[PDB]
Amino acid sequence: IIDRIDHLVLTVSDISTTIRFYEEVLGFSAVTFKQNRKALIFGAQKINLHQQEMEFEPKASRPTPGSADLCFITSTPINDVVSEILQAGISIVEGPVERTGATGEIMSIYIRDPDGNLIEISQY
Amino acid sequence: IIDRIDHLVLTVSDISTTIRFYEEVLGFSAVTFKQNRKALIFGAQKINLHQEPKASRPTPGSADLCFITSTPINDVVSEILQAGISIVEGPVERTGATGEIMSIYIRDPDGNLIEISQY
Secondary structure (H helix, E strand, O other): OEEEEEEEEEEEOOHHHHHHHHHHOOOOEEEEEOOOEEEEEEOOEEEEEEEOOEOOOOOOOOOOOOOOEEEEEEOOOHHHHHHHHHHOOOOOOEEEEEEEEOOEEEEEEEEEOOOOOEEEEEEO | OEEEEEEEEEEOOOHHHHHHHHHHOOOOEEEEEOOOEEEEEEOOEEEEEEOOOOOOOOOOOOOEEEEEEOOOHHHHHHHHHHOOOOOOEEEEEEEOOOOEEEEEEEEOOOOOEEEEEEO
């Protein structure tokens, strides 16, 4: 019986650049575990980071920057989030638009991180 | 304020092969919605399957995911072996999002790395 996703690994070109984006835009918090590895903490989950040329094993069969397509749920009014994104100088790929969430309908806004990963920020 | 991951999209070579793996091994349940869209559900989250908009570089086998199980991890190891699935690594202690976990690693049909763990 699987309960939830605990974490996932993003392979990126530059960890510093990735960290700045997730902290400043999404509000995540960067930490260092296993002495020298980086992760981004949010809620009760996390995203571990692997930089190209120094990806820890085992890893995906085809580690690829910009191959992620993730949806994050926000408790912030989605229109306020839209405004926050524009004020941060981030381009809106699409949205706000209605989508199907895991447990119901959500309003989603899409942006991209430094590596091209698609980030869907949504409110139920 | 971001609360959690709701879902993510996996780009795969064959939806049917992918669904069978996640249903038979991980116990996920496949569903259809809207334009004959397919997804795998578990807990209060889901994984959408693509065989726009999307990732800048949709790539099969590029996922590295960790799922939490409430099933005794050693029983999970046995289930995996009985299913004829190769164990990449584990059981081994690893760092979870909120503490130590015991993890077992396997791969799905596309080569995605799947970490199944218990706190």
